[PDB]
Amino acid sequence: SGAIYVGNYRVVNRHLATHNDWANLVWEDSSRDLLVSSTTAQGCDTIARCDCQTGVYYCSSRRKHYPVSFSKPSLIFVEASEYYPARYQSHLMLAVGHSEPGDCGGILRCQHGVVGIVSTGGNGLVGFADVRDLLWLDEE
Numbered sequence: 001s002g003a004i005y006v007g008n009y010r011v012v013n014r015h016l017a018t019h020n021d022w023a024n025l026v027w028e029d030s031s032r033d034l035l036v037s038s039t040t041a042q043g044c045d046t047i048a049r050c051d052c053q054t055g056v057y058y059c060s061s062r063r064k065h066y067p068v069s070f071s072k073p074s075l076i077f078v079e080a081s082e083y084y085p086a087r088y089q090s091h092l093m094l095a096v097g098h099s100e101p102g103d104c105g106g107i108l109r110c111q112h113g114v115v116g117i118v119s120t121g122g123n124g125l126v127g128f129a130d131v132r133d134l135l136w137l138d139e140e
């Protein structure tokens, strides 16, 4: 579990979005595994605006933050998980590291701020849904 709290937006994995998220929906994309809802209180996070390929992510199934190198966001085939069938996921970055389903929502960050959230795992990789292209998160 986990979210990004930027301005008056909550960014969550689409598959973990709640009824309240859907009732306060700003934007969602199944192919990216993202959903954004509106918040009453302003949030503490800054979104990275960069093309970094190194950062640090939180792994809840280890209670640990790990430094990783990661691929640039791409359209990638993802094998079946507990929460999605085998399918193509867009705007996905991969690193070598540990990720189980409940790790979804952990933040990946670089020197510029939040890069994305854990969205995939298995086979010794962790996949992150990028948010650095979503420039509208920084205003309004």
Ligand SMILES: CC(C)N1CCN(c2ncccn2)CC1
Pocket (backbone or CB within 6 Å): 080, 081, 082, 083, 084, 085
């Ligand atoms: C949500 C649904 C599409 N899933 C969940 C069950 N399943 C699976 N596959 C691999 C590992 C664990 N569970 C495939 C079908």
Ligand SMILES: [Zn+2]
Pocket (backbone or CB within 6 Å): 048, 049, 050, 051, 052, 110, 111, 112, 113
């Ligand atoms: Zn960066």
